[PDB]
Structure 1
Amino acid sequence: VDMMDLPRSRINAGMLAQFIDKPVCFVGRLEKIHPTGKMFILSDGEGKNGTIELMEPLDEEISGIVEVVGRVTAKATILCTSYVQFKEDSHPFDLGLYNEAVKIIHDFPQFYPLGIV
């Protein structure tokens, strides 16, 4: 913990609020990188913003679609413990579609369960 041993919930930014302190999975487009390298902004499939906080300043540069894994802060930002740049080079990732999937994941937890049930 290091959260790789727990279920993590795929959310959009619309849901941050309903997820304080829970482990989550935020997929978004890189909007801004803070000068310090310690914080950055991703916009979800509905074009809304989530703030990603870091422990160590960003190691190298990132952009495009990033998938962040972290705990939702008291301030409803995300303390990130790892991220992944999405292989985009041959086909662009439809961020809007993914957003529908997220919604559907939450209308149907009996069919996309979270953790051993």
Structure 2
Amino acid sequence: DMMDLPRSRINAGMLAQFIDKPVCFVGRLEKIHPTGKMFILSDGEGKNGTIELMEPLDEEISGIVEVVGRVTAKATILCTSYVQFKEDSHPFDLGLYNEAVKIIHDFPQFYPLGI
């Protein structure tokens, strides 16, 4: 299991530099497969991520969602866990989140994510 290792925050643009790596993808839910085993998320710059679930969905995902999982050889995320951001007070600014994510990567010495 991955919940005990570092999990890099990324957007669609990175998916291919993270093949086989445990990650943390945050984006807005756009479409969920019928067999609720494959939904997709649009990151903060609009690029799209394809989240695959080893198992079918109980409740209804929707809105901003954070997924943790491992990047596939086909540049997708086999999702191990996901949480839905709380927005009842304020709408989560996804484009800002995105600028942070790029900032994290431009300065890994200030936001470590290895070992």
Superposition pairs of residues 54-65 of structure 1, within 5 angstroms: 54-65=53-64
RMSD: 0.8
Normalising to structure 2: TM-score of the pair? 0.98
Distance 2:111 2:23 in 1: 15
The alpha-carbon deviation at position 115 of structure 1 amounts to 3.7
Distance 1:7 1:55 in 2: 21
SS in 1 for 2:59: coil
Percent of aligned positions that are identical: 100
**Which residue of 1 is the match for residue 87 of structure 2?**
88
- Unpaired runs of 5+ residues, structure 1, are none
The alpha-carbon deviation at position 56 of structure 1 amounts to 1.0
SS in 1 for 2:57: coil
Residue 78 of structure 2 is aligned to residue 79 of structure 1: yes
Give CA deviations for 1:34-61 in whole Å, capped at 9, x if unaligned.
0000000000000110000001101111
Residue 37 of structure 2 is aligned to residue 28 of structure 1: no
Distance 1:26 1:81 in 2: 12
Distance 1:114 1:77 in 2: 20
**Which residue of 1 is the match for residue 97 of structure 2?**
98
- Unpaired runs of 5+ residues, structure 2, are none
